[PDB]
Amino acid sequence: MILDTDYITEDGKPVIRIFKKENGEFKIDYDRNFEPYIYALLKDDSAIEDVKKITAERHGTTVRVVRAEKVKKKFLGRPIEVWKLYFTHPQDQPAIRDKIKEHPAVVDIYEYDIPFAKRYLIDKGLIPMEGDEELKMLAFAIATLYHEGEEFAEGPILMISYADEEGARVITWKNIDLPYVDVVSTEKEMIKRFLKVVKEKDPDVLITYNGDNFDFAYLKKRSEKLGVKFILGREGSEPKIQRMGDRFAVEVKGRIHFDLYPVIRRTINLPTYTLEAVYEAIFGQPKEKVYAEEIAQAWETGEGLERVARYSMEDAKVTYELGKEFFPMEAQLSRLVGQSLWDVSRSSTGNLVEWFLLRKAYERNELAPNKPDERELARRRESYAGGYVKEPERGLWENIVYLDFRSLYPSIIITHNVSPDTLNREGCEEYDVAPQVGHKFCKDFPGFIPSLLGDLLEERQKVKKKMKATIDPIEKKLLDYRQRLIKILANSFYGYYGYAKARWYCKECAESVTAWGRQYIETTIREIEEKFGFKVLYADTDGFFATIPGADAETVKKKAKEFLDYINAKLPGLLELEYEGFYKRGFFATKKKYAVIDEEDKITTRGLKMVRRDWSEIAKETQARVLEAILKHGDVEEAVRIVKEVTEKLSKYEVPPEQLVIYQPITKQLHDYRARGPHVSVAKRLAARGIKIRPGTVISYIVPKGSGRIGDRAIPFDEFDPAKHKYDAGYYIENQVLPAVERILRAFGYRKEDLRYQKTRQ
Amino acid sequence: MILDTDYITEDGKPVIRIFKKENGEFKIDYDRNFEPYIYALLKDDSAIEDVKKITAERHGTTVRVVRAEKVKKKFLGRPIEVWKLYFTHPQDQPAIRDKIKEHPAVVDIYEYDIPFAKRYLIDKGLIPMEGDEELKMLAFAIATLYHEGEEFAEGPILMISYADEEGARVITWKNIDLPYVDVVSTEKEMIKRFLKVVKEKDPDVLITYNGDNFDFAYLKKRSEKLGVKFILGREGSEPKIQRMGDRFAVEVKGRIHFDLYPVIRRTINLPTYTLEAVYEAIFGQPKEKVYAEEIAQAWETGEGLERVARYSMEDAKVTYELGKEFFPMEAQLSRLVGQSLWDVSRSSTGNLVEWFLLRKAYERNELAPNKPDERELARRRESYAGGYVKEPERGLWENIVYLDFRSLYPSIIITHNVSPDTLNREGCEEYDVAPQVGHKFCKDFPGFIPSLLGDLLEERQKVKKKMKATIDPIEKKLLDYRQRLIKILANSFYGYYGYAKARWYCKECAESVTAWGRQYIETTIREIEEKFGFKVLYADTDGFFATIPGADAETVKKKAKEFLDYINAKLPGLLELEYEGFYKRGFFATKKKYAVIDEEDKITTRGLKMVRRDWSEIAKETQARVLEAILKHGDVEEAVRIVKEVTEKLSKYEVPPEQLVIYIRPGTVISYIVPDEFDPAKHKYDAGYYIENQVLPAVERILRAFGYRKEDL
DNA sequence: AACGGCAAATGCG
DNA sequence: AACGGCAAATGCG
DNA sequence: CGCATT
DNA sequence: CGCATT
Ligand SMILES: Cc1cn([C@H]2C[C@H](O)[C@@H](COP(=O)(O)OP(=O)(O)OP(=O)(O)O)O2)c(=O)[nH]c1=O
Ligand SMILES: Cc1cn([C@H]2C[C@H](O)[C@@H](COP(=O)(O)OP(=O)(O)OP(=O)(O)O)O2)c(=O)[nH]c1=O
Ligand SMILES: [Mg+2]
Ligand SMILES: [Mg+2]
Ligand SMILES: [Mn+2]
Ligand SMILES: [Mn+2]
Ligand SMILES: [Mn+2]
Ligand SMILES: [Mn+2]
């Protein structure tokens, strides 16, 4: 299989290098004949004589057009003849493309900003990560000596740990007596030993957790200080640190540096992305965190260094385990997009779609449209109508089914041939007209993007069938992320039509997809209510919750399956409504906010959690009891007795002050805050008192009754005393308990006045 | 008359500038001898040799202590000897004060954060705005070209309008044919013409409405783009834009930039503070609003520019008229506090109290306590018991008198000598002990704050006497705001004791004032009920509504006057209960919520009416009829027949849809109906909405007191 | 700009 | 590195 | 405006 | 809390 491609320059000419692993052997193949080029559309063919003579400069070197070739291509399916302008070196292109575009005889230029190594993979039809080749993997982590107020990598690396299928080891330059610890004389010998381990093991994949921004840069500064050639690359090169957006990315030539951080960050939704939080979220097992301040104290005092070495060993061990689980998903994405694993694992969804389209356009002899200029970008900022969100039905409902369209927007694109090359194309025998917006789409030939979505949907469904049939819950969770990645990718082709920077931008296509979606959902709602006696409780874009008011579970399931057979027979092409779930009870508060309970007693809440906001244990506990009373017990009157009980106890000062602690994290330096909330106000006072506040510190505070605003009175819970200080009962009622439970009890007709304590007169 | 003070630096030394207007002539007086200083309390006098040698740095400049002087002062009435540490420049103080405080021989430092120019006004005994000097005033406004999604001042100023006693004019760079419009060639010539107008007129006061945050900053960016020296200051300086908390404030040196916005914002309570809303609230006359989008379209198309010029002219005209009315109040406040009009018009009530106390402390050789640090601020957030609020007696009551104490909390402070310097002071022959909280206050000598409140109460009563005898309702309304500002100022000395940032903070003093107030009101209630046979219906802090159940108007008034004579003879010092009003009928719903009607048929409602944007005429009209039936007719059964009549008519679609109207640009009123050009022959209004969300919520809050719930209505 | 986010508690919704 | 932005709208708070 | 739900 | 009444 092909792992990656790049290019080097030999005598001013580029040489493509293809990094491969074939039959367990690493190989580098060289192509010295592939030439860079761009296209030019001219107003007249005779002007090519003047265009061939255009020159530019590139550090003393005169840049010239090597040769030209008139080629017949297509632009949005319409034939167009352009001139393929060849160059000696890819860096000639940025130096001369503006001068060629500015020539009076040149109407426009195309495919001028495609990186040379990626252009090679596309033009040669090569796809990375193909085949039954087994890759050797090795994860690594570093433990460093940190002291606040110091420059980056000023302190030494204390330990370098690594892990693979054979186990995990730690290299350190202090005498720690553990079986997996290798003790060396100095930091220099430790780095040299790690470099030796990677050369001996010769891994195809180097796994890190944030190695793109921390591990490699730290190793680089330490190697520069110690005079060590950190030759990790298979061709003797050192790691190549490049700028990627607002951060950095690191390559190790001949190997795949798989940094798990960007992959995990876009795959799983978590409040924190520490290696410990990621490991527990995936494997359901805890990982102990040993902080930087503890590592430094253990090193300087010599005490408890076994705990630091164990923490370091487990960093490498869990990074290897996480790498094993997430690599198959990324390797499949590399095959789909047709680009290296290093690229697809770090690139945005917009870039994945664009790289996939550039390849398919090449296969189909289609000229790629250019990225918009500043003027065109300003023209593409207008929005369009999206999905339909029904206002939910107030009240408690029983025996509810959730029906949802399978891959709605991609199925609409395939069925109705929604593409920029089919939009208002004259001369066709057949058209599909988008409702409301009226855009017409030619149906005589498959459109560019519609013809490509089918295979993605087929691939996703194969993964879903594998998933539902998986015994292992970890493997099933990873297959769930895999099918969801393809689901998000397929939907991003729709989004891409309305994305201002898209090459194949088509706002008409985007608003037609949403218009057809709005038509299908509203028609389906009308159909289930009028033909089958269902009541649609709530709907959002392509799915809805419905029930037959006076019917048992067996009847509602039976009639939902009858409706699905009926509606699926009426729906055209790839459009299909699926049975997604059954819920015993369910309440629908507002749009995007509701809670449902399945037959196994599992509650699913959407828009109700709101965990980023500041919540007290009393508000969390009250909302938990309210939802338990409504969904589990089916008793709305009990839920309102709980809220009235809590507000009465808060007013009477009967609630233990332990339930009033608000915990919220400090996420940056205290000086870097724009707005000062209660948690920041407490933290600034604690910092002034000598307490070390750092990003990650949780502030546990309580609001007392007093003079100033919330943050002014707010104090740490370690300073509160119920025998001296009276808590702010009104705050816990009006700002914590009531806002959280009112949004739920709105559905049953209860307002804030009904939830508050009686205040009876004597 | 002193308008303002500031300082400049000449050869590293400060020079105070006093901006004056004497006999119609503007003058600048200079003081080159006033020195900055702070105080240090040392553990031993010999350590002054080490303290004198402390140095700091200030951009390459070595900061040193110029000289020291041992001075005898008082800290909370107790003699304390401190060292007055003098410096060359006021900016030396922030650079070296922490190093002096951190010295092991220094116990504490004082008066280290007083701005130099304000320190000068205090130490010299100078008070701004004194005398019968007449000030020349000029208001101004600007009309700009706005386009959404652009940076601040990216578009030009289209018109600059100004107004004074001689009239209002508009300078613009487009040919508009109006008598008051002066047409110039460019935006540059318009700004230069405006600068010329202000230099020629030479006004003492420049009036704006939000000029601190919009007008001056817009002019600044446009002048920087056009290369114009905007020398508005009398010394040739440009407007000085400074940060004041979360907003900005602008000075024009030698003149008083009077921005009406902060003054109006704290004086009048309104849902919106647009210039149009403020003008109608004060003068009772409407002002048309021409929006930014209309101004831009008029300018780009050339159509209807007369309407824009008229709007611009009226902005300057009404800002001048409002400025004339609000300047006397602010000029008097400047004399009371002893600080410039620019400062007193923009500072909070707590800063006015503090600047007044800093001046009085200087006069009395009293060291000012320091403001608290973050740790001390956190220690002062504990609350204390406030006023007493009696649960009201439900039902409709007749022939009710309202008796209320005159300046309660300030009178308690004066009578019982409630002050931080008299609190638990040992050695006195006489004390007053606060009830419940038990704090003792020495009575042998007048306390600092108690000795200052008497003159404020005297001043307020002089304004009240003038007010009640004023024929003009506008002048009477302005005097009402003036006496109320002194009433709130006097009550803020009490609040100041319990204010965490206060220098003269004393929570014991604050809770003793409230404790004495709770004792006087509950004692008075017990006294009127047990001795005079009255029934106290409702009470809040220092006043109560009472009646003699089976008595006519003449009897209740007569017996209330007899009780006042009796109770006033028992009350000590400055404590006095006043006859504040008589009401034919009154209904008391909950605490802070009730409605009373006087003999002239005027209804006063507290806590009942709301400033909500959703006012349907049917809900307002129904609530008006309900209150009229309860207070005028004394018939609860009629009020409930009215609500049942309205809900029945709404259900039957008999109410005209004009009574159901509820009423993006800031200030735009939306007039809508729940189902603008509604048609009863096609559309049916939401009867249930007008019953359950408009009529019932408004009238139920009132009919609750008589036992009626939403189901009965 | 140096001093300015802050006068207090009680109570309803 | 030469490419690289971070696929879309609806809706609550 | 950010984040959550599609 | 937010705003109104003291
Ligand atoms: C989740 C999601 C939805 N949408 C749009 C397109 C989807 O077709 C539509 C409905 O959302 P979904 O029901 O979440 O997605 P889906 O129909 O594509 O997939 P599935 O078979 O699992 O139901 O909302 C996006 O544009 N982007 C997204 O990431
Ligand atoms: C109005 C008001 C009252 N209070 C306190 C102190 C007052 O003395 C007490 C009673 O309020 P008021 O009766 O409104 O005020 P007053 O007694 O000072 O003045 P008047 O002679 O007009 O009756 O409530 C404040 O602390 N701040 C205020 O702004
Ligand atoms: Mg869905
Ligand atoms: Mg009163
Ligand atoms: Mn689905
Ligand atoms: Mn779907
Ligand atoms: Mn009074
Ligand atoms: Mn009073």
Residue numbers in the entry:
A (entry chain F): 1 to 762
B (entry chain E): 1 to 663, 693 to 704, 718 to 755
Quote the original article.
Archaeal DNA polymerases from the B-family (polB) have found essential applications in biotechnology. Variants of the archaeal polymerase from Thermococcus gorgonarius, TgoT, that can either generate HNA from DNA (TgoT_6G12) or DNA from HNA (TgoT_RT521) have been previously identified. Consistent with all other DNAPs from B-family, TgoT and its variants fold into five distinct structural subdomains.
In a second experiment, crystals including an incoming nucleotide trapped inside the polymerase active site were generated. The crystals of the ternary complex of TgoT_6G12 diffracted to 3.2 Å, with two molecules per asymmetric unit. However, the thumb region in the ternary complex is mainly ordered. Indeed, only one internal region from amino acid 666 to 690 as well as the C-terminal part from amino acid 763 to the end are poorly defined. Contrary to the structure of TgoT_6G12 in the apo or binary complex, the finger domain of TgoT_6G12 in the ternary complex shows a closed conformation, indicated by a rotation of 24° of its two α-helices (α14 and α15). In the ternary structure of TgoT_6G12, three metal ions are observed at the active site, in the same position as observed with the structure of KOD in ternary complex (Mg2+ in position A, Mn2+ in position B and C). The presence of the two manganese ions was determined by the anomalous signal. The incoming nucleotide (ddTTP) binding site contains two tyrosines: Y494 and Y409. In addition, Y409 forms the bottom of the binding site. ddTTP packs with its sugar moiety against Y409, as previously observed with the dATP in the structure of KOD polymerase ternary complex. In the X-ray ternary complex obtained in the presence of a DNA-DNA duplex, seven of the mutated residues were well defined, which corresponded to V589A, K659Q, E664Q, Q665P, A681S, L704P, and E730G.
